[PDB]
C-alpha cells in the first residue's frame, strides 16, 4: 500500500475492530497464540509495521523490551505519546520511523543490547503484504540475520474470502481481488495494495536469501513465516 494511504487516514480503517469479521478476529487470536508460544525466547519484540503500537501492551505486560517500526509519522507520534503518557523509559520502549526495507540500517547489532537469538522481528496483521518490494524486505531481513515472525494469510479461496469480507468493510471507492503467480492481491484506488503470497511462491524466495523459514498455518486463514532458534 501507499504511504499517503495511511498518512491521509484511509489506512486507519484496517485496525478498526468494528470492521473485523469472525475469521479475522480468529486470525488475530491465533497470531497472539503463536507469539505467546515463543514468549520465553523473546527479550526484544521489534514490531515491523507497528502503527501506534498494536503489541506494545503485550511487551509492557510481559516485561519485554519493545521497538515499534513504521514509516507513517502520525503512527510513530501516536505510539510516542502513549510512552510519554505512562512515563515508560526509552531504554526499554522505542519507536523508529522507517521501512522494513532498511531494517539492516535501523537495527545494527550494537543498538540492540540483547543477544540476536532473543530478538524477534514480528510483522503483525500482514504488514509484510502491504510493503512495496518484498524482495528488498527479504534481503534486509537476511542482512539483520535476526529471528522473525511474518504474520500473513494463506491463498486458499477461504483465506481470500476472509480477507475480502475484512477489506470490503473499509468501504473504499472499489475493491479488486486478483490471483497471479505470486499470490492474492487486494487493491483500492485510495492507495490500498495488500498481498498474501502463495506458500509455493514465497518459500523459495525466503531460501534464496538464506532464511531457514517454516510456513506455520494458524487460525484456518493464517500462515506464520517463522525463522530463528525459538521455532525449533
Ligand atoms: N515498508 C514498510 N515497513 C514497515 N511498516 C510498513 C511498511 N509498509 C507499510 N507498513 C505499515 O504496516 C502497517 C499495517 S499494513 C496491514 C494491512 C492489513 N492489516 C492487512 O491485512 O493487509 C501500517 O502501519 C503500514 O504503515
Features:
SAM-Turnover; Rossmann fold; 35% helix; alpha/beta; binds S-adenosyl-L-homocysteine; Natural Product Biosynthesis; Proline-Homologue; 232 residues; Catalysis; seven-stranded mixed β-sheet; lyase; monomer; three-stranded antiparallel β-sheet; 23% strand
Order of the strands making up the biggest sheet: 3-2-1-4-5-10-9
Put simply, the count of helices is 9
Small molecules (ligands, ions, cofactors) in the structure: S-adenosyl-L-homocysteine
According to DSSP, the number of beta strands is 10
Name of the CATH architecture: 3-Layer(aba) Sandwich
What is the molecular shape? globular
Indicate the CATH class: Alpha Beta
Main beta-sheet strand count, sense and barrel state = 7 strands, mixed
Binding site for S-adenosyl-L-homocysteine: 70, 100-101, 126, 130, 153, 167
Amino acid at each position: 500500500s501507499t504511504l499517503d494511504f495511511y498518512a491521509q487516514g484511509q489506512g486507519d480503517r484496517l485496525i478498526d475492530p468494528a470492521r473485523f469479521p469472525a475469521e479475522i478476529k480468529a486470525f488475530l487470536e491465533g497470531e497472539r497464540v503463536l507469539l505467546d508460544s515463543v514468549a520465553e525466547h523473546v527479550e526484544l519484540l521489534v514490531e515491523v509495521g507497528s502503527m501506534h503500537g498494536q503489541h506494545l501492551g503485550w511487551a509492557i505486560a510481559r516485561g519485554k523490551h519493545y521497538i515499534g517500526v513504521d514509516p507513517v509519522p502520525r503512527y510513530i507520534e501516536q505510539g510516542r505519546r502513549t510512552l510519554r503518557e505512562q512515563g515508560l523509559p526509552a531504554e526499554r520502549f522505542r519507536f523508529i520511523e522507517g521501512g522494513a526495507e532498511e531494517l539492516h540500517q535501523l537495527l545494527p547489532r550494537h543498538a540492540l543490547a540483547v543477544p540476536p537469538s532473543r530478538c524477534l522481528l514480528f510483522f503483525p496483521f500482514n504488514s509484510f503484504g502491504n510493503m512495496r518490494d518484498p524482495e528488498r524486505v527479504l534481503e534486509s531481513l537476511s542482512m539483520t540475520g535476526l529471528p522473525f515472525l511474518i504474520s500473513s494469510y494463506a491463498t486458499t479461496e477461504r483465506a481470500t474470502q476472509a480477507r475480502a469480507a475484512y477489506y470490503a468493510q473499509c468501504q473504499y471507492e472499489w475493491l479488486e481481488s486478483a490471483c497471479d503467480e505470486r499470490g492474492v492481491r487486494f487493491r483500492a484506488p485510495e492507495g490500498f495494495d495488500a498481498m498474501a503470497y502463495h506458500v509455493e511462491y514465497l518459500e523459495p524466495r525466503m531460501r534464496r536469501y538464506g532464511l531457514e523459514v517454516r510456513p506455520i498455518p494458524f487460525a484456518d486463514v493464517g500462515v506464520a513465516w517463522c525463522a530463528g532458534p525459538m521455532f525449533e
